[PDB]
């Protein structure tokens, strides 16, 4: 994070560090807003090549909420 | 309800009343377990003849639950 800190030591700037990671074989997106896209696009290539065998998702047990927490969120209403 | 009350005045029995409603133009199912099917099968023909124009469902406002009610159901947990 922090490429546009310079837009307000040279090798320890975020732009040049991201670019040196990108030139050395780290799957770097063009900015932060493509981070979900590049994670998704790596994971699709990992599923579609027999690398990751995903887990069949099962519902968990469920606790009741805390009163002192679910009072702040406004789900409980007592006078 | 109550066709098999006799299986433990004659025209005031549930079997004969259901059959007399069925002979007079009331859409009676064969028993209670086809009631949802016959309601659904009437409603489909009511949609497919331009009779009922259904409402576009919109989410409602939401109140918080009562504490004294949502304590009995076990959603709230305070010592």
Q: Which of A61, A72, A75, A79 to mutate to test the interface with B (most CBs of B within 10 A)?
A: A75
> Considering only CA atoms, which of A61, A62, A41, A44 is closest in space to residue A52?
A44
**Cβ contact B76–A65 (<8 Å):** yes
DSSP 3-state of A77: strand
Question: Is residue B66 within a helix (H) or strand (E), and if so which, with residue range?
Answer: strand B65-66
Nearest CA distance, B72 vs chain A (angstrom): 12
Cβ neighbours of residue B75 under 8 Å, at least 6 residues apart?
A64, A65, B65
* Interface subset of B 15-74, CB within 8 angstroms of A: 63-68, 70, 74
Contact A65 B74 (CB under 8 A): no
Q: Give phi and psi for B23, each to the nearest 5.
A: -85, -5
| Phi and psi at residue A77, to the nearest 5° | -145, 95
Phi/psi of residue B65, nearest 5 degrees: -70, 155
Residue A25 annotated as binding? yes
Interacting residues of B13 by C-beta distance below 8 A, sequence separation 6+:
B5, B6
Nearest CA in chain B to A75: B64
Q: Which two tokens stand for residue A67?
A: 């009163």
User: How many residues can be counted in chain B?
Assistant: 79
Elucidation method: cryo-EM
Report how far residue A75's alpha carbon sits from residue B73's, in angstroms, rounded to the nearest whole number: 14
Closest Cα of chain B to A61: distance in Å? 13
Q: Does A75 touch chain B (CB under 8 A)?
A: yes
**Which residues, 6+ apart, have CB-to-CB distance to B52 below 8 Å?**
B43, B46
| Torsion angles phi and psi, residue B76, rounded to 5 | -120, 140
Pairing mode, strands A76-77 and B65-66: parallel
Resolution in A: 3.7
Residue with token string 């040279």: A10
Quote the tokens at residue A31: 């900015």
Q: Is B52 left (phi over 0), alpha (psi -120 to 50) or beta?
A: beta
Distance in angstroms (rounded) separating the CA atoms of residues B12 and B71: 47
Q: Please state whether beta strands A65-66 and A76-77 pair in parallel, antiparallel, or not at all (unpaired).
A: unpaired
Q: Is B10 on the interface with A (CB under 8 A)?
A: no
């Amino acid at each position: 994070i922090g490429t546009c800190a310079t837009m307000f030591q040279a090798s320890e700037t975020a732009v040049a560090k991201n670019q040196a990671l990108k030139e050395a074989g780290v799957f770097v997106p063009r900015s932060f807003d493509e981070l979900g896209e590049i994670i998704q696009s790596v994971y699709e290539d990992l599923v579609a090549n027999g690398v990751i065998v995903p887990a069949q998702e099962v519902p968990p047990p469920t606790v009741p909420m805390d009163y002192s927490w679910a009072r702040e969120l406004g789900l409980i209403r007592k006078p």
